[PDB]
């Protein structure tokens, strides 16, 4: 009620959903998760559950942790519906702040090098071996795409990424926004 209209200022125009139909979801949800929280482990079986062709954990668990750098505790519906729109719906420039989040691995406010390796290794795990024959030479592996990654942004090896600058990479560089590209549908679509 109250918890379907934070939802919908969060979002804004990236819902697929009411406030009605959020508050029809809720009450399913309360249902299966009746004290209104998901664990990373239940978070992490809808993964496994709707990307069989992929091998989903890592991903999902970063995707969990976007919120908070925690992989402990829980989600509440709130994150758990903004979560599934992030990997899920909508368009991947109209979530940058939240994919700055993402890529932010430990939470301490910029990007390390390493963070980049870790998300990308992630998402990687989401293509299907059948797709990943079809990406370019030097965007095949993680480490190529991390790479390139590092080096559309200018950086050094030690270096640290703001969110200011990864803001405006991903808005100026396509090349950038494609490589960081965290959504599985659109990896693969771009790929084909
Ligand atoms: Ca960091």
């Not at 505790?73 to 519906?81: A, H, I, P, R």
């Not at 932010?104 to 998402?123: P, R, Y």
């Not at 803001?167 to 679509?189: D, S, W, Y």
Request: aromatic share 12%; net charge negative.
């Amino acid at each position: 009620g109250a918890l379907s209209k934070e939802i919908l200022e969060e979002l804004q125009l990236n819902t697929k959903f009411t406030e009605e139909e959020l508050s029809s979801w809720y009450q399913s949800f309360l249902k299966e998760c009746p004290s209104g929280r998901i664990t990373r482990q239940e978070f992490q079986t809808i993964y496994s559950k709707f990307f069989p062709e992929a091998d989903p954990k890592a991903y999902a668990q970063h995707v969990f942790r976007s919120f908070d750098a925690n992989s402990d505790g829980t989600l509440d519906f709130k994150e758990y519906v903004i979560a599934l729109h992030m990997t899920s719906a909508g368009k991947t420039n109209q979530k940058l702040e939240w994919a700055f989040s993402l890529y932010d691995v430990d939470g301490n406010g910029t990007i390390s090098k390493n963070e980049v390796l870790e998300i990308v290794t992630a998402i990687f795990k989401m293509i299907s071996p059948e797709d990943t024959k079809h990406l370019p030479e030097d965007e095949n592996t993680p480490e190529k795409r991390a790479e390139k990654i590092w080096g559309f942004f200018g950086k050094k090896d030690d270096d640290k990424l703001t969110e200011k600058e990864f803001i405006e990479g991903t808005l100026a560089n396509k090349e950038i926004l494609r490589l960081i590209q965290f959504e599985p549908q659109k990896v693969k679509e771009k790929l084909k």
